[PDB]
């Protein structure tokens, strides 16, 4: 009950958390909180992403909700922002994306699994290629790097500290006693 | 045991699933039977519900390599790999029993979790395997490759007369 | 419940517990409690530590939150403060870190197994080395015992018994009856 | 369930129920209750024990919490108070440790396990020896017998009912009918 | 749901239940209920017994708590009262122990197991012998029979209904109606 | 959720349900409800039976508690009401036992199991003999049939509808409407 | 969560759901709801069916409860109404049974299993025969079809839609819009 | 059984995954074949889906050590370890069946839970294993070593003609002569 | 049966994990080979991933006890206890395959739950076994005992030439070499 | 088959847990060896970690009854019942390898759920077993029985030299060239 | 194998629990031994921990029917049915080792779920088996039947000398001088 109570007060203070792997349930949760907070168009929402990624569709839902509510979304990284959580980190409005000094960030290409007949395998493979291209171009759009730079940096894996991410363009600035 | 006896009457069974162990056993038996007499035919009996593609390829190449004629008999069923193995026999020696079913379908595969590049490579490989399967089915039958390609989109079951009309077998045997 | 009621009534007194291994949800809970209590800046928060340690990224999130707010944090060790619970124990404000007389403190290097392909193994290994060096230098800064000494003492498990922790510099004073 | 409200109502009378296999959760609950009740210094705190023991590091935290506060602790035993539950029973203030008739008390040495390489096994074994000697000396200090007497008695196993426990020094007096 | 409210209000009136096997948590809850009801020292507490027995120590704690308070206790056996359930049924105040006409009562010696080295097995065995003779003497004292007669009777399980139970001293009277 | 509210509101109307197989917990709940409703003596209690049987001792406890109170009990049968459900159905106040038109009834002898040493097996066998003959006697007394007739009939499973029930004597009337 | 209050409100406007396979628990739920709503004799009750089947006894209990009260019941099919679901759908008052335009209705004679001795197997076989004839004649009466036609159609697994449902006599009208 | 005869005419089947027991049996048979006749070539048939690296190295060493020439035939498939075993034969005697696949990729391994020092030691060990594997592949092939480095980054599947052009197969057999 | 042919030529082959049954088989085979001819050498081929310590000790004692010289060939890997057996051969006759590894590390063990005294006794026994292993490794090698103590703290992997420099082996085989054949 | 050749020279291996089947096999082999030659030595090699007490007593009685001298040789470890079997050989013919360990401790046993009387009977039986154990150990050793009881209270581990001074074995054999 | 030799000189081991398979094997060996030579003795060595009652009765009947005298030797232990077979040998030729034990107690059994009548039938059979057990024990022992009935109420463990005093055996082996 304590966790629910503190989350009650934080939601009353316009604070949202994503401290777990992303799936459909937490996607609905975040969308519901954002829609409820969208009733106030002049205020902003603070977001506290620290998750080891999750599902593609849930992340797309949250990203579209962020771009829909028209409100300013302040996104903060605290612990590990990896895979899809990193994409949600950069999804915030420009100039309001931050990472804590000891926060650590990850980028890598999507992974999935396929099974079925040959035609189904081909269809799923081409959809996987298409969504990989969409992720690459969205990342290159949000961060001031070209598509080729991202698609070669996200070939296998890459890590970032606070200042390396700041200079790379993933975030805008780091907080310290702010 | 009757298996060894029918081995010296030069008859080889394929009544189990077509996997690596059974493939190696059949390949060794074919090599030994060619060694014993390189002029008499070798009889291959098929009662298998398909198997892996690599075993199909190995047994196909082994049958195509040797001089002695591969006389293929089908009882009960010959699905997936077994259909290609039956159709891979020497012309005029592919015969099957009256009420026997031959099933043909595109290969089915499953892979574990992996990155996009690995899945793309696996998809390319499975497409190449399907193309090779269609190539062998076309070169070892009378039906044009286009109709074979269209037919393996979904599972197709053929009787002995249907197989004969398709071109996989030569004649139907009922009673000696 | 009874536990929920007592935890609520203690939170009204700005008292926080960490009596479980550190992981995602508990770190999020602690961060939420700290952010809620940070409304009043001139008050201090008591943080009781009794844990065998846990995940690295969650603890880094908690530590960044502790260093983020202007409020002073008084860390009190009870039971044991092993592994990274010690790290959070020594992260309190100087002169306000304490341990009970019958408290044991444990220090050792991080451990997190790895698997995958050769290049991925290399990347994870170099990240593990980097984070080990980061932890060593951070605890050196918070205890003032140089870097080489900390690295030498972190090869294997080392135990401290209140007064030994005091002379080592991990804590500031061993509390008695207030 | 009825247990929650009945425990809340009895806690409103400064009566604390203990007794389960002692672990981190129950120790944290007891410490929280003691800290909450420590607001009023001049009222006694009754603590009832019926447990088969538990982990050492949690009971030591409970012991430190009891010795920390000003409030006198009156410990009552019934049924079975064994292993380190006996230690927590004897930790009470002198002249305020009582056991009901037909209440069993048990003393024995601690137990643990070993795993790892030779160096880790040696370190953990020396830590276990230190913990064992600390337990023996604390028991001797609280009961009044010599260290060697407790060491000889608490080697294999030792049982007590009310009266020989009273004369030994584990229990100050046996109460019945108020 | 309904059970919680009905148990709450029955506890409010005078009623306490033992409709499940005796163990640690049920004994703790019954002891808490008895202590709470002991606040008013004039009215009597009605206790219904329907259980196949339970652990020795928990039953001992309940029995000692019953004897500790000055309030009269009226034990009523319903459905079944076997092993320790019978013992707690007969432990009530004289002249106010009752059973239902269709109730059954079973008596037998305790049971346990042994494990460990020879010395520990010997110690546990002598402990069990002492406990068995203690139970024999208490049940003889509370029932009115001789120690040796009860010792012969409690070699194998023996059954009773209300009539030979009441002439055996197990219960005082039987009511068909209130 | 809704079940608790609807059951409480029906309990406010002196309606008691006995769905699902009979066990110790449901027996205690039914006894609690009966003792609660016994507060007002000049009222009636309606009981609905949809149970396929249950424990022997729990059924005896429920039956004897039902006989204990002065309030007339109206048993109503629907569904199956077999085994012990049938026994509790016919145990109501004479002239106030009813079954719905599409309500089956089943009668058969009790069943149990035996395990242990030969002497204990013999003791349990004679106890089961006593219980079975007591059940036959009580059934003959309540239904009004012959002891030998019921004993002969209840050797295998015997099935009735509402009619053969009413001319058999298990019930007194069949209710079609209100 | 939301289910509790949405069901409370829907009960306030006298709406009852059966959206699951029928068992003892939901049988008691429906019976309790019908009995509670029977307090008002003039207003009707609405009940919806989305179920793939259930047990015979629970269906008989619900049917008997439906015909017991004086209030009219409107049964509305909500897609899949098979086995016992359609029987409870067709058991409503004539002229007030409806099905959604895209609904599935299925009828088939019941299924069960046999285990035990030969005499017991024979007894259960004759019981199954009697209950099958019971069901066949009941559905023939309710649907207005001959017994032989119903028996012929129920042997296999004949399906229906809303139009065939009304022309066969299973339902009275197809409800579209309000 | 045909297996005993195939042993009699100096042919060894490798049809199961490369483990300790299989490698031990294969090398024992190789030693016996070398002892019985130190001049007639030994034929090795490859039909295995890879295996452990230590068994790979043991078989490779015992195959390079023996005096008689080794005649390797790829049969069905030869993935990972089997690819190296096929390509390690005597030059001019490494041949494959017409339809066949040779799969090459960098080693994959799993390391249990442990301290950072043990993990970095294991990382050094697996890097050394990869370097040794690519060097062995380069030695017994015409392909440049850097080409192999970039090729074995992911799965690489080659047909009989692709293996022939790569430098792993000397010629392809079609029909008995 | 190739294994029988190897045995008739006095080759004892060890390719499984070292446990009680394997140790008993190896000791029985060594005793039988010594009885057959107390002059001809006995060859031991090692492909084992370590094993228990008591079995290692029994095999080592049996190897040191028999009259004939023992020729050890490292073959694949020698992970934990097999390395000691490889180093326990007759000096000058301990060889290894080219692409082989030899691993060395301190023994790993775990004990069940028990009282503190039992754990102290177990720890003393484990320390004694570790000291014994260090002594055996120092006796049959070149590096000083302090270097062994420092090295066996963590897993140390050595190649064929690394082992030769360390002194565990004496020769590295490359290819079959014919005899001089000079009449 | 090395084991057959070993048995041809009157050598018996005991390298498995001491249970009913192993005890029966050992006793059958001992009876066969006595029947084939009643006045020539029999060698028993011990590499077992222990086992049940009843099988230990059966093997001990069979060894004592069979008249030819029995030479017990320890190779790896000899723990619990294995130590008793090793010490039960003919005096002057008990040997151990240079690097070996002998482990002795009091018996450990488990019993199921039961009444107090059954537990008391089982406790009496296990105390009788332990007393028989000290009697057997003291009979074949050069150590006072009180010291035996004090030593076997917990796990006692002895090396070859410690066992030789303790009286369980009679010689530590280093090599063959050095007789 | 030693077992074949000991069978050649007429030896039967009982080292497993008493069940259908062991009893059936005992039948086969006893009948074959009687057929081969009905004059020499047959030796049965028991190291069993107990077993079922039906196999007990069947083996007892077979030993009684077989007219050559049967020696019984208790080597490691004899519990429940094993004690009965120990006492069922030819009088004057029942032996036990020095450090051996004999365990006797009333039979233990369990019944499945069922109606009261079936449980009564099972209990009647259990009592009949128990009565047959003490009757068979008193037949081959020198103790009064009442003493056996009172003693087998719970478990009872006797040494070799205690068994000799009780009448279970005739001689206690010491050694071969």
Author numbering:
A (entry chain C), C (entry chain B), D (entry chain A), E (entry chain G), F (entry chain F), G (entry chain E): 31 to 208
B (entry chain K): 52 to 227
H (entry chain J), K (entry chain N): 52 to 228
I (entry chain I): 52 to 234
J (entry chain H): 52 to 230
What did the study's authors say about this model?
Two distinct groups of ClpC1:shClpP1P2 were obtained at the resolutions of ~3.0 Å, referred as conformation A and conformation B, respectively. The main difference between conformation A and B is the various positional arrangement of the seam protomers in the hexamer ClpC1 structure. In conformation A, only five of the six LGF loops are bound to the shClpP2 surface, and two empty shClpP2 pockets are found between the ClpC1 protomers P6 and P2. In conformation B, all six of the LGF loops are mounted on the shClpP2 surface, and only one empty shClpP2 pocket is located between the P1 and P2 protomers of ClpC1. Linear density representing the bound substrate of unfolded polypeptide (likely casein) was visualized in the central channel of ClpC1 in our determined ternary complex structures of ClpC1:shClpP1P2. Differently, the P1 D1 pore-1 loop is bound in conformation A but unbound in conformation B, whereas the P5 D1 pore-1 loop switches from the disengaged state in conformation A to the engaged state in conformation B. Although the protomer P6 is not engaged with the substrate in both conformations, the P6 D2 pore-1 loop takes an upward shift of ~15.4 Å (distance between the CA atoms of Tyr597) along the substrate in conformation B. Notably, only ATP molecules are bound in the D2 domains of ClpC1 for both conformation A and B. In contrast, ADP is the major form within the ClpC1 D1 domains, except that ATP is found in the D1-P4 position of conformation A and in the D1-P4 and D1-P5 positions of conformation B.
The Clp protease system is important for maintaining proteostasis in bacteria. It consists of ClpP serine proteases and an AAA+ Clp-ATPase such as ClpC1. The hexameric ATPase ClpC1 utilizes the energy of ATP binding and hydrolysis to engage, unfold, and translocate substrates into the proteolytic chamber of homo- or hetero-tetradecameric ClpP for degradation.
